[PDB]
Design a protein around this ligand. Structure first.
Ligand SMILES: *[C@@H]1O[C@H](CO)[C@@H](O)[C@H](O)[C@H]1NC(C)=O
Ligand SMILES: *[C@@H]1O[C@H](CO)[C@@H](O)[C@H](O)[C@H]1NC(C)=O
Length: 385
């Protein structure tokens, strides 16, 4: 259930690109190629996937999520069957870069833990058009489940997970009406903010949600806003007081203090947010509460006559929480270890790898350990000659 805002309001980051396959690539066998682009702002971006320099058709996109620091995520993926000589790339156009960036494919909560709900709301003012584009994405445990997009010919909240088909029409009508309210709220706020910062594209973001534990009781609630991808105002953990990021947001804070806005959101986070997440978790039991254990292996990458890189892979796991660690004769090497952010592999599962540089001839004294709730015991494995 989406939040409902009350009183209104009173820079570029270059993307990071990762290109990888869902399964270990075998020539002539079906697979999925992923292009995972993160940490960029503004959200507008153009992504193409290439095979031998040719645009690949029917590329799917997971759109319009963002992280705690307000920078945007996107996942582009397409099924493909690789062969030995083909070359594959991902080409990204973003306003933070002078020219397009091409990255080539190198062939070398959830479950039983805590749970959370989030609504990621973004309005972007467009120069050639009147109204801003307003998008709302709802998430349960890293899984998109609802979406509203004002660029739709008939804008409406739509189900994005199969267990939301269960909700009757009055649910969708009620959520959609909230979205239209939010759209007006964001539109007038964008106009106020343009004056407040004395400006002449612009972005306004909201993130709201509740965190639950394993007992499914409220751990913490959030309600935070950003302008131009930078903190503006956030509701503190007490759900009573506000933290303002600059002098403009201080004016908004005192206005929202006079009007008791914090209590309106406190009631949503403590009651509605918690109770309907419970229902979503139970309706989506088979999907959200499953555990898929990781399959793990170690690869060998010589770099000179004296040194080699060992990379510990974990594939096909759900939920996303996982711990990869390297050890040398029993003691852990976390400080001198190279990791990659846990990444989605395009089918509901996730991937991660961790690497160390070791002297050639001592590979057998290094061990990788994998911790995952889907594993009855932690996995221990080492490079196999
Ligand atoms: C999920 O479904 C199974 C089978 O229907 C049931 O036994 C289990 O208790 C359910 N889990 C939760 C958390 O509702
Ligand atoms: C390293 O590996 C070898 C091979 O098993 C072993 O003999 C040795 O005790 C291990 N540990 C150290 C500290 O050398």
């Amino acid at each position: 259930t989406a939040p409902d805002n009350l009183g209104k309001m009173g820079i570029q980051k270059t993307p990071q690109i990762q290109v990888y396959s869902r399964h270990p690539p075998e020539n002539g066998k079906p697979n999925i190629l992923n292009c995972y682009v993160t940490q960029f702002h503004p959200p507008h971006i153009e992504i193409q996937m290439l095979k031998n320099g040719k645009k690949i058709p029917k590329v799917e996109m997971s759109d319009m999520s963002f992280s705690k620091d307000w920078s945007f995520y996107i996942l582009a993926h397409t099924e493909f069957t690789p062969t030995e000589t083909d070359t594959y790339a991902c080409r990204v156009k973003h306003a933070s870069m002078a020219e397009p960036k091409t990255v080539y494919w190198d062939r070398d909560g959830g479950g039983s833990g805590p749970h959370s709900m989030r609504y990621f709301e973004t309005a972007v003012s467009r120069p050639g058009l009147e109204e801003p584009r307003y998008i709302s994405v709802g998430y349960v445990d890293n899984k998109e489940f609802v979406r509203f997009d004002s660029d739709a010919e008939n804008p409406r909240y739509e189900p994005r997970a199969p267990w939301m088909e269960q909700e009757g029409p009055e649910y969708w009508e009620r959520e959609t009406q909230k979205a239209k309210g939010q759209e007006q709220w964001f539109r007038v706020s964008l106009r106020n903010l343009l004056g407040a910062y004395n400006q002449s594209s612009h972005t306004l973001q909201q993130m709201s949600g509740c965190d639950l534990g394993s007992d499914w009781r409220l751990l913490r609630g959030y309600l935070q806003f950003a302008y131009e991808g930078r903190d503006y105002i956030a509701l503190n953990e007490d759900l009573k007081t506000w933290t303002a990021a600059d002098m403009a947001a201080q004016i908004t804070r005192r206005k929202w203090e006079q009007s008791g806005a914090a209590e309106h959101y406190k009631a949503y986070l403590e009651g509605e947010c918690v109770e309907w997440l419970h229902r979503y978790l139970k309706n989506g039991n088979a999907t959200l509460l499953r555990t898929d254990s990781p399959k793990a292996h170690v690869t060998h990458h010589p770099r000179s006559k004296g040194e080699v890189t060992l990379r510990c892979w974990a594939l096909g796991f759900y939920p996303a929480d996982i711990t990869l660690t390297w050890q040398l004769n029993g003691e852990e090497l976390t400080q001198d270890m190279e990791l990659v952010e846990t990444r989605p592999a395009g089918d509901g599962t996730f991937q991660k790898w961790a690497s160390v540089v070791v002297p050639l001839g001592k590979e057998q004294n290094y061990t990788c350990r994998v911790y995952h709730e889907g594993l009855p015991e932690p996995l221990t494995l080492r490079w196999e000659p």
